[PDB]
Amino acid sequence: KPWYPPMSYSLWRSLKPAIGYENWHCQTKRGFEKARNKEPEVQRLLSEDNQPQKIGKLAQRGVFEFHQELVRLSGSHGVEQVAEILQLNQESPEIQARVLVILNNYYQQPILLNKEIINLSRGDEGYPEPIVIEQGNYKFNLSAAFDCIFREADDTIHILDLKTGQSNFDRRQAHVYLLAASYRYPQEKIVASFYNLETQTSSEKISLSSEAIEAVKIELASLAKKHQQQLQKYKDHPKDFYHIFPPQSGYVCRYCPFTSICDYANKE
Numbered sequence: 686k687p688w689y690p691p692m693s694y695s696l697w698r699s700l701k702p703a704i705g706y707e708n709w710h711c712q713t714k715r716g717f718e719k720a721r722n723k724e725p726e727v728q729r730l731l732s733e734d735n736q737p738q739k740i741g742k743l744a745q746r747g748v749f750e751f752h753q754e755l756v757r758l759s760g761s762h763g764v765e766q767v768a769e770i771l772q773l774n775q776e777s778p779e780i781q782a783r784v785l786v787i788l789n790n791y792y793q794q795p796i797l798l799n800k801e802i803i804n805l806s807r808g809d810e811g812y813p814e815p816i817v818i819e820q821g822n823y824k825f826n827l828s829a830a831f832d833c834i835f836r837e838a839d840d841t842i843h844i845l846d847l848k849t850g851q852s853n854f855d856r857r858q859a860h861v862y863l864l865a866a867s868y869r870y871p872q873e874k875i876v877a878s879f880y881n882l883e884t885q886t887s888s889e890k891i892s893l894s895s896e897a898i899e900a901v902k903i904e905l906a907s908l909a910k911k912h913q914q915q916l917q918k919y920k921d922h923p924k925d926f927y928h929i930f931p932p933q934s935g936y937v938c939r940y941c942p943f944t945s946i947c948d949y950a951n952k953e
C-alpha cells in the first residue's frame with residue numbers, strides 16, 4: 686500500500702475554476718469536501734446526493750440495463766421494465782419525469798447498440814484503482830471512472846462519458862480520461878467524447894498529442910502538490926480554516942452543500 690498524492694477531475698475542478706466560471710468557485714467548498722470531510726456534519730451533508738446526481742446515476746444504470754437484456758430495446762415494453770429495474774416508482778415525481786424522458790430517449794436511439802462495447806459501467810462501482818503517474822520524480826495517484834469504453838471500427842479506443850441535465854462539457858475531464866486510458870491501452874489510439882442522454886447531444890472527438898499529455902501531467906502534478914501543501918497548512922494551523930481555503934461568498938452560496946455550516950455563507 687504505497688501512498689501517493691491523489692488527483693481526479695473532481696479535485697482538478699475543486700482547485701481551478703474552469704475558464705468562464707471563475708465567480709462560481711469557492712475554495713472553502715474544497716476545504717469542506719477535503720480536509721474537513723471527516724467531521725460528522727460535513728460527512729452527513731456530503732452523503733445526500735442532489736436530484737441532478739440521482740438523475741444521472743439512474744440514467745447510467747438505465748443504459749446498463751438496456752444492454753444487459755437486449756430485448757429491452759427490441760421489444761415494445763423495454764423502457765417500462767427498465768424503469769421497474771430502476772425502481773423509479775420509489776423516486777420523487779420530477780425524478781421520474783426526467784428519467785422517463787431519458788429512458789425513452791435511449792430507446793428511440795440506443796447510441797451504443799451499433800458499437801463494440803468494451804465496458805459499460807452500472808454507475809455504482811466507485812473509483813477504480815488509481816494509476817501511478819510519474820512526472821519528473823513526483824508520482825501521484827490518478828483516479829478516473831469511465832462511464833463507457835467502446836472500440837471503433839478503426840480499432841480506436843473511445844471513452845464516452847454519459848451526462849444529463851444542463852451540465853456542459855469540461856474538456857479537462859476528457860483530458861483526465863485520455864491520460865488514464867493511455868495506461869490501460871498503451872499501444873492504441875484513444876479518443877474521448879461526451880454525450881448528454883437528456884438532450885441527445887454529443888460532443889466532438891477529443892484526442893491528445895504526446896506534448897499535450899505531458900502538459901496535462903505537469904499541471905496535475907502541480908495541483909496535487911498544492912492540495913497537499915494546503916492540507917498540511919490546515920493541519921499546522923487548525924484554527925485558520927477560512928484563511929487556507931478562502932471563501933468567495935454570494936448568491937452561489939445558496940447552492941453549496943455546506944450553506945448550513947459555512948460562516949461566510951451569504952444568507953440574503
Ligand code: SF4
Pocket residue numbers: 711712713714717932933934935937938939941942943944947948949950951
Ligand atoms: S456557503 Fe458559499 S462561501 Fe461557504 S463554502 Fe459554500 S460556496 Fe463557499
Ligand SMILES: [Mg+2]
Pocket residue numbers: 741745832846847848
Ligand atoms: Mg455520467
